[PDB]
Subunit: 188 residues, 2 copies
């Protein structure tokens, strides 16, 4: 159960920022298409900053004893792939990237907020159990993420590429897995 | 009376685009930085879209590269990665790369028209030579780039993250190499 009127306003924000661009889009233009009163808009978000803050949070927001690393890591990779293959997520991603790319102040809120995650937590756990090779958990997670995002995120965000078909999806997951564990696994 | 002028207006546009982005930069803003009339710009680049095209040409101009059967895969592939990382760690290149990335997200219509190959041909040659497992070269090239771009392209271009340090640059190059050949190489 989430709040459907918040979502209404967020949705219109995405659409409008997608249409007009972020900085030229006003709270009343948003309200006009949320089909809401300027008033109920300010209640939820007192400013575009506070609204941008919420969109950001939403964005990059999306280890077991001995079941095989493979089995459990397959499952992780699928979780992240199912999230990437959501067009409402790609949309938000697009407007957020679009809003930060040529905006220094917005870049510095991105980058202060990307200094405080799942793949990382696991790699560190897998390492303590002596099943993965010593490396900075964050260094390893980035590669992990890159092996998926390079097919299922960036093309879509930058070029409006199609979603991956399921065949394509497991294809990319599978080689990511194979490549990743290939290099990092200490075999037990 | 136009030798200077073309280049001067392409330099203008590169500086202005690099600073505020492709979309928000308008023609007589470029005309101003280039110190020429708006029509003077408008008859060199008949449209803003001819600017974007030229922006690509430039980006491309920063890009051996042929496959050598007689030496290690690692030698030649370290060389490719490092050539690719040398552009990645070049601020002019990232700026130019940023305008281009920004211009296609901001425009569904030009992204749609405007879709690396160096690596994919090196891969298919290596596969012919029996040294890499069968894989779509395109797909494996994408993965190779992702291992560099994730550290040294996307952060910098989408949120002006700091360039990688020399140490960091040569760790992501080593690691990509190891990761890639670990899985793909037929030794």
């Amino acid at each position: 159960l989430t709040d459907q009127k918040r979502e209404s306003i967020v949705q219109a924000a995405i659409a409008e920022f997608g249409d007009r661009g972020f900085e030229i889009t006003s709270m009343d233009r948003i309200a006009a298409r949320a089909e809401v009163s300027k008033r109920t808009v300010y209640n939820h978000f007192p400013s575009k900053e506070e609204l941008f803050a919420e969109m950001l949070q939403r964005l990059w927001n999306c280890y077991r004893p001995l079941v095989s690393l493979r089995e459990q890591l397959l499952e992780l990779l699928w979780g992240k792939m199912r999230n990437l293959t959501d067009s409402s997520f790609l949309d938000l991603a697009r407007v957020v990237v679009g809003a930060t790319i040529h905006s220094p102040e917005r870049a510095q809120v991105w980058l202060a907020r990307i200094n405080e995650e799942t793949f990382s937590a696991w790699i560190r756990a897998a390492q303590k159990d002596g099943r993965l090779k010593p490396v900075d958990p964050g260094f390893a997670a980035t590669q992990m993420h890159a092996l998926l995002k390079s097919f299922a995120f960036w093309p879509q965000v930058t070029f409006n590429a199609a979603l991956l078909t399921p065949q394509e999806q497991s294809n990319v997951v599978e080689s990511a897995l194979n490549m990743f564990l290939g290099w990092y696994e200490i075999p037990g």
